[PDB]
Amino acid sequence: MQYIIGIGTNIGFTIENIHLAITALESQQNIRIIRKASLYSSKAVLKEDAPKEWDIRFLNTAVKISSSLKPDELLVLLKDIELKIGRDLNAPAWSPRVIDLDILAAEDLILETDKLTIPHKELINRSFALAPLLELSKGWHHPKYVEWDLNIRLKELGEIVKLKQTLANTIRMGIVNLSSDGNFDDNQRKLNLDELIQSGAEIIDIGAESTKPISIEEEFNKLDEFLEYFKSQLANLIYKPLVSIDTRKLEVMQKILAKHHDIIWMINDVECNNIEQKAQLIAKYNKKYVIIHNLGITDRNQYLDKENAIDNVCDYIEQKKQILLKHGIAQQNIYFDIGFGFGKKSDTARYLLENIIEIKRRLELKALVGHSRKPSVLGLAKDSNLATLDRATRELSRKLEKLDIDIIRVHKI
Numbered sequence: 449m450q451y452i453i454g455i456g457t458n459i460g461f462t463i464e465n466i467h468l469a470i471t472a473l474e475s476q477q478n479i480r481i482i483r484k485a486s487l488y489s490s491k492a493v494l495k496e497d498a499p500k501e502w503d504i505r506f507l508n509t510a511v512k513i514s515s516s517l518k519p520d521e522l523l524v525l526l527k528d529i530e531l532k533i534g535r536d537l538n539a540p541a542w543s544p545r546v547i548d549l550d551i552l553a554a555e556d557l558i559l560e561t562d563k564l565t566i567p568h569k570e571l572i573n574r575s576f577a578l579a580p581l582l583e584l585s586k587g588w589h590h591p592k593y594v595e596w597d598l599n600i601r602l603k604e605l606g607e608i609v610k611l612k613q614t615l616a617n618t619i620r621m622g623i624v625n626l627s628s629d630g631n632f633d634d635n636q637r638k639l640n641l642d643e644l645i646q647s648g649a650e651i652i653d654i655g656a657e658s659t660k661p662i663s664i665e666e667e668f669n670k671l672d673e674f675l676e677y678f679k680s681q682l683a684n685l686i687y688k689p690l691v692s693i694d695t696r697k698l699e700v701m702q703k704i705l706a707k708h709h710d711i712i713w714m715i716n717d718v719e720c721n722n723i724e725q726k727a728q729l730i731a732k733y734n735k736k737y738v739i740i741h742n743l744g745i746t747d748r749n750q751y752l753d754k755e756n757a758i759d760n761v762c763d764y765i766e767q768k769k770q771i772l773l774k775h776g777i778a779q780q781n782i783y784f785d786i787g788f789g790f791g792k793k794s795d796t797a798r799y800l801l802e803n804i805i806e807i808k809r810r811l812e813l814k815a816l817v818g819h820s821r822k823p824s825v826l827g828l829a830k831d832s833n834l835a836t837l838d839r840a841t842r843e844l845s846r847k848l849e850k851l852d853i854d855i856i857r858v859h860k861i
């Protein structure tokens with residue numbers, strides 16, 4: 449029995465909620481995932497006088513599955529999954545929700561009961577459901593209305609953006625470096641935020657440290673400021689990216705989490721000093737954390753050669769990993785990062801990159817790869833122009849995506 453399952457969310461970490469739903473389905477032995485749709489963005493469809501608090505942009509998709517679950521049984525499952533993910537199914541109708549799962553279609557089945565109607569009653573009135581459905585089943589008609597060309601119907605409905613964010617194994621982390629103002633204007637950091645979201649960044653990495661020593665106060669205030677602006681723009685954003693804080697200072701981590709933990713997904717450490725206190729902090733806030741190989745080598749003669757680089761990298765990260773684990777932190781919440789720009793010779797960086805899969809395998813941690821615009825990693829001349837850097841970055845990005853590298857950190861998508 450094939451089904452299309454509609455998935456929607458407009459609260460919490462949106463792409464994560466969707467992924468959790470799909471994983472929960474895929475975990476069932478009596479369900480087979482046939483295909484996942486693209487990601488679609490739309491304004492909350494609301495009743496005419498609903499509180500503006502409910503007006504938060506949606507992320508929608510659908511998945512096609514095969515199952516031995518009969519329709520009523522599958523509905524029970526869907527509710528069970530919404531519950532576990534954290535939805536309040538007695539909450540007011542039309543209100544925001546962490547996850548929503550419905551049966552959009554079941555081939556040409558027509559089922560009409562009070563408790564369950566298939567196809568879903570509103571399928572042909574909702575672009576955020578009909579779009580992903582049509583993406584998955586190209587020639588599909590509502591079985592009651594076989595004469596109705598739903599491609600034209602979808603066009604009539606409009607009001608839907610097909611995002612460039614995807615549900616792929618590899619997510620793109622767009623770089624928001626807050627370290628070009630004019631007489632009356634300083635929104636370049638905002639204009640670049642849009643460029644990232646539009647081009648498909650699933651995550652954004654916000655940092656105020658430069659790659660000149662800057663105070664805790666300055667760093668924090670720069671972060672705090674962008675995050676206040678992010679918050680003011682949240683509800684209308686066509687896609688709400690996961691947020692990573694890019695910093696090496698414990699105090700900054702603490703202050704910023706204390707104030708904005710609700711909207712932060714990940715801490716991306718630039719230098720894993722005081723791993724013990726940081727571990728305690730990651731445990732307290734339950735965020736993702738990225739271990740980087742940055743030993744703070746200041747002498748170029750002492751940079752890592754390639755022949756022992758894999759042992760040097762893994763030994764160090766493993767040691768930091770175990771400390772995190774010993775603080776109760778779930779291994780699945782920890783990522784590693786080679787840190788190409790730190791303490792490594794050119795051929796070493798290139799070498800660590802070529803052997804990235806071996807490293808992930810040995811570390812048993814997911815990988816964050818920061819290759820963007822690094823000549824050494826890209827196998828390019830250091831004095832290469834921005835154009836040749838981004839073209840080499842995109843090509844490498846394609847290869848890492850195919851390798852199912854977990855996160856790639858890039859200046860542009």
Ligand SMILES: CC1(C)Nc2nc(N)[nH]c(=O)c2N=C1C(=O)NCC(=O)NCCS(=O)(=O)C[C@H]1O[C@@H](n2cnc3c(N)ncnc32)[C@H](O)[C@@H]1O
Pocket residue numbers: 455456457490491492493494506508523541542543548549550551552562563564565566567568569576
């Ligand atoms: C809030 C609203 C209208 N706006 C939206 N705007 C955008 N852009 N995107 C959205 O995804 C979106 N979703 C919306 C919305 O309310 N969606 C539906 C929702 O939450 N429903 C929960 C309340 S409920 O149906 O009574 C649940 C109940 O509906 C029943 N039901 C009947 N047919 C069903 C089917 N085919 N699949 C699943 N359940 C079925 C089932 O008994 C369930 O308990």
